């Protein structure tokens, strides 16, 4: 009933496995639609081929900067930035998908996948989905991070799209 998207993750070019997400379009339709379209590539740009640039074990894996590959870039399907839709959903545990930002109302394309409860981000980052399948892949990704977030190998979204 909500949409599902997938990422096929690779590590230094070698496939690791698929992560699928449920997007809570029933609660955050504008934010879900952004991520869904960036995953299908239907606006002529998006997540395919981009990297996870900041992975902090025990916290989260951050990605989605498909324009500058370092945190400084990214763009939404609506323009460079869009508003915080709402903060209905909370950072309740591992597998939550939420927007990265540069302060209030600055959503673009960068996102994070939590590997722990991150409740101090409630009311500041818009939660819009959750890992459905492949949490083991996300845990595998964590192994390549570090305390400052720099990754020890290149972690890429080799392919992505919509399942259901």
């Amino acid at each position: 009933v909500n949409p599902t998207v997938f990422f096929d993750i690779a590590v230094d070019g070698e496939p690791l496995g698929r992560v699928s997400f449920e997007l809570f379009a029933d609660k955050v339709p504008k934010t879900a639609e952004n991520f869904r379209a960036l995953s299908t590539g239907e606006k002529g740009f998006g997540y395919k081929g981009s990297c996870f640039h900041r992975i902090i074990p025990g916290f989260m894996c951050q990605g989605g900067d498909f324009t500058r590959h370092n945190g400084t870039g990214g763009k939404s399907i609506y323009g460079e930035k869009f508003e915080d839709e709402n903060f209905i959903l909370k950072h309740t545990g591992p597998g939550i998908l939420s927007m990265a930002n540069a302060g209030p109302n600055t959503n673009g394309s960068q996102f994070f996948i939590c590997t722990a409860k991150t409740e101090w981000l409630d009311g500041k980052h818009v939660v819009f989905g959750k890992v459905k399948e492949g949490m083991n892949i996300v845990e595998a990704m964590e192994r390549f991070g570090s305390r400052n977030g720099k990754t020890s190998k290149k972690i890429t979204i080799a392919d992505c799209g919509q399942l259901e």
Binding site: R54, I56, F59, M60, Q62, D65, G71, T72, G74, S98, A100, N101, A102, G103, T106, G108, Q110, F112, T118, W120, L121, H125, G149
Partner: peptide
């Protein structure tokens, strides 16, 4: 965060 990354646990 996306731009100035600060200390503690932010995105």
């Amino acid at each position: 965060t996306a731009x100035x990354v600060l200390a503690x646990l932010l995105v």
